[PDB]
Design a protein around this ligand. Structure first.
Ligand SMILES: CCCCCCCCCCCCCC(=O)CSCCNC(=O)CCNC(=O)[C@@H](O)C(C)(C)COP(=O)(O)OP(=O)(O)OC[C@H]1O[C@@H](n2cnc3c(N)ncnc32)[C@H](O)[C@@H]1OP(=O)(O)O
Ligand SMILES: Cc1nccn1CCCCc1ccc(CC(=O)N[C@@H](CO)C(=O)N[C@@H](CCCCN)C(=O)NCCC2CCCCC2)cc1
Length: 422
């Protein structure tokens, strides 16, 4: 259908038909001297803008913008609540630039009415290093939808990034578009089933009673794992080396330096429990050789439409890593596959205890990576929403996000997708 995308049909992206043999760039090489130094045009009523995260009324402009016009569920009763803190983490990774925090203020009043964003990252498509940028936070004010302002924001953020000599991008979106490299599904391990129920995040399956469900989803008040401790700087190297090792396993990943890792996993110390964004943990055995690591972050829902409650606490399982299976085999071979499982099913379970204890009403995950071994087992239910990963200017061989054709967790053949968008 690429032809019906009046805009996308002009972009360096893979296609629906097109099968590939050799993964590589889509445009004939370019160089910054080739790119325009002039920001694109926009109706006279509006002026481009650049957002300094460290400016307080600018962060404020964005936080408000997205807080009222960003992504909602398919039925519009819940909306993402990205907090200023969260922005402070995600928009300032190492290498970030204010020139890539593009805003679009209306000139007469200056009201921020559009945003699009890029932070730099280095991909690992089938192990082939690829200097790219990661895109996220594309948002246009509700009263400005359909004015086809988006292709501009893209055309403009692309332009700025080319000017820094980068030519590739990783972006994920829900809607279907040109080259889904892979796809995944969100799932939900209820922490506060009754509340989820009282705000219509879920319903009551027949033959069941709140007690039944409430008991069915019950979680221990204390984690069940020795060595289970929360990451510190001191660990980085072993951890980082551990993570690096583990993720080797997937066809599509981010190639974290050590710094743009520590930042990604240990957030600003100042912040209190109700503010904190990233929750990273590790398992330090007696001899020290920490063997386990997993993280998750907090990204609530603004419960629009409800009188019983105004906010939903949600914890998204982030990155994780474990030595189980590999020190064992070569192939992800059975005796080793199930070897991981039990160890995984044991980690995440504590993630759910941990997340629950941090006040998260529901714990989410994606059927990407080896999520599939523990999901069903750990009671992660099927979400109604899905996520599509894409690559701008790059021929990639379709990779795996854990879904059998009936959108069922593919427990056998897991997921080749290694990144985890924020
Ligand atoms: C190497 C450098 C290059 C780097 C750049 C790489 C690509 C980046 C672009 C992708 C950015 C998405 C990433 C994320 O942020 C995560 S996903 C988070 C996304 N956020 C939201 O959904 C928040 C709430 N929604 C809105 O704010 C939305 O308003 C909107 C901004 C998403 C879309 O704006 P709009 O509804 O007013 O439509 P429009 O008239 O302005 O433009 C339409 C054209 O753009 C495409 N259109 C509509 N929604 C789209 C979407 N989410 N992604 C992409 N295209 C979209 C369409 O396919 C179409 O074009 P066609 O004619 O071709 O069909
Ligand atoms: C990069 C990025 N980060 C965040 C967003 N994006 C990009 C935007 C495109 C990705 C996207 C769009 C919209 C959403 C919101 C969303 O889809 N929410 C769904 C996720 O699946 C949801 O809340 N599902 C819940 C509630 C929806 C109810 C209203 N329809 C569900 O299935 N709940 C039932 C769970 C239940 C299963 C059984 C066990 C108990 C829990 C998520 C991601």
């Amino acid at each position: 259908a690429m032809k019906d995308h009046k805009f996308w049909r002009t972009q360096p992206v893979k296609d629906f038909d097109e099968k590939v043999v050799e993964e590589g760039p889509i445009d004939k090489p370019k160089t910054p001297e080739d790119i325009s130094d002039k920001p694109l045009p926009l109706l006279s009523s509006f002026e481009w803008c650049s957002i300094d995260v460290d400016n307080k009324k600018q962060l404020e402009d964005v936080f408000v913008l997205l807080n009222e016009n960003y992504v909602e569920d398919r039925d519009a009763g819940f909306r993402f609540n990205y907090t200023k803190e969260f922005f402070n983490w995600a928009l300032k990774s190492p290498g970030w630039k204010k020139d890539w925090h593009i805003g679009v203020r209306v000139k007469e009043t200056q009201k921020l009415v559009a945003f699009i964003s890029a932070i730099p990252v280095t991909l690992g498509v089938r192990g082939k290093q690829v200097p790219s940028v990661e895109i996220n936070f594309l948002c246009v004010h509700k009263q400005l939808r359909s004015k086809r302002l988006t292709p501009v924001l893209i055309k403009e953020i692309t332009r700025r990034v080319n000017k820094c000599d980068i030519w590739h991008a990783l972006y994920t979106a829900g809607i279907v578009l040109p080259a889904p490299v892979s796809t995944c599904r969100y799932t939900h391990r209820p922490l506060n089933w009754k509340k989820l129920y009282e705000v219509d995040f879920t319903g009551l399956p027949d033959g069941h009673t709140e007690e039944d469900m409430i008991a069915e989803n019950a979680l221990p008040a204390k984690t069940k794992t020795a060595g289970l401790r929360k990451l510190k700087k001191e660990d980085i190297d072993q951890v980082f080396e551990l993570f690096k090792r583990y993720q080797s396993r997937f066809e599509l990943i981010q190639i974290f330096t050590k710094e743009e890792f520590e930042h990604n996993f240990i957030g600003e110390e100042s912040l209190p429990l109700d503010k904190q964004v990233i929750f990273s943990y590790v398992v330090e055995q007696p001899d020290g050789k920490i063997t386990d690591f997993f993280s998750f972050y907090s990204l609530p829902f603004t419960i629009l439409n409800n009188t019983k409650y105004k906010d939903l606490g949600i914890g998204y399982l982030y990155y994780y890593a474990t030595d189980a299976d590999f020190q064992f085999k070569d192939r992800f071979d059975p005796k080793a596959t199930k070897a991981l499982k039990t160890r995984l099913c044991e980690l995440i379970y504590d993630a759910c205890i941990l997340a629950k204890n941090a006040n998260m009403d529901v714990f989410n995950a994606l059927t990407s990576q080896d999520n599939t071994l523990f999901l069903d087992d750990l009671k992660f239910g099927p979400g109604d929403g899905f996520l599509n990963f894409y690559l701008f200017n790059y021929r990639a061989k379709p990779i795996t996000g854990g879904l059998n054709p009936d959108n069922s967790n593919d427990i056998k053949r897991r997921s080749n997708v290694g990144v985890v968008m924020l």
